[PDB]
Design a protein around this ligand. Structure first.
Ligand SMILES: CC(C)C[C@H](NC(=O)[C@@H](O)CC(=O)O)C(=O)NCCCCNC(N)=[NH2+]
Length: 241
């Protein structure tokens, strides 16, 4: 099932890397945000997202995949009423690929039937691995976007721009994607001095209407270990090589 410390070398080598910014939105690494509408199925959109990114990097093809199929057929995940990321990736391999999002479109909380035969050629993974709670920035820069868990509040929903570090949550309650890291030098309005504010860049599952054209940023530090709102305690990324 592979581990970080080995697979890292396959790509990292070991240059050490600018911990300030790398953003997959800009190197053919980020597929478009989608809207899970009413239905608690982020676990599905997060996982399907992370693979969509691996395909667009490691084999440079654009694909939208049926997160619906996943809800209907992933049995170690409890449909629209929740699920876990690894469980998805496990069920993913068992199914041996998922249908194009066109042959098998998404329909939110509408009851639908698992139907493997609905499409012709399918798109699989080969394995998945877990990321340690620290080497995040190292992972992203070299491996790609990640699927991760997080704790959320109602303050959270109303986000619309800039750095957020507001109210978190009691325990992890939503699954989404890491897509990079960055930094804007912003001037402390009181001391009025060059302060470097580091942020993680994120993709959600609530439409382009929400946040920054669908995304949202969160403060952190240069090392990348400020994991605000229990960031990435569960954290896996899919591989196809
Ligand atoms: C990575 C995990 C922690 C995320 C998750 N949180 C949720 O809110 C899910 O309903 C998915 C969602 O989109 O909201 C979740 O599924 N939590 C519970 C996991 C246990 C299985 N879920 C059941 N039995 N409802």
């Amino acid at each position: 099932q592979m581990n970080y410390e080995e697979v890292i070398k396959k790509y990292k080598g070991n240059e050490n890397f600018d911990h300030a910014a790398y953003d997959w939105r800009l190197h053919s690494g980020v597929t478009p945000v989608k809207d899970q509408k009413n239905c608690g199925s982020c676990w599905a959109f997060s996982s399907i997202g992370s693979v969509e990114s691996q395909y667009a990097i490691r084999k440079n093809k654009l694909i939208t995949l049926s997160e619906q199929e996943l809800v209907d057929c992933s049995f170690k995940n409890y449909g629209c009423n929740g699920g876990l990321i690894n469980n998805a990736f496990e069920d993913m391999i068992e199914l041996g690929g998922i249908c194009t999002d066109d042959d098998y479109p998404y329909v939110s909380d509408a009851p639908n039937l698992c139907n493997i035969d609905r499409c012709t050629e399918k798109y699989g993974i080969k394995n998945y691995l877990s990321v340690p709670d620290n080497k995040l920035k190292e992972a992203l820069r070299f491996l790609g976007p990640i699927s991760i868990s997080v704790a959320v509040s109602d303050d959270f929903a109303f986000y619309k721009e800039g750095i957020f570090d507001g109210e978190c949550g009691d325990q992890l309650n939503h699954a989404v994607m890491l897509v990079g890291f960055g930094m804007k030098e912003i001037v402390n309005p009181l001391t009025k001095k060059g302060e470097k504010h580091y942020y993680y860049i994120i993709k959600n599952s609530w439409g382009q209407q929400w946040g920054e054209r669908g995304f949202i940023n969160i403060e952190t530090d240069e090392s990348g270990l400020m994991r605000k709102c229990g960031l990435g305690t569960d954290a896996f990324i899919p591989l196809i090589e």
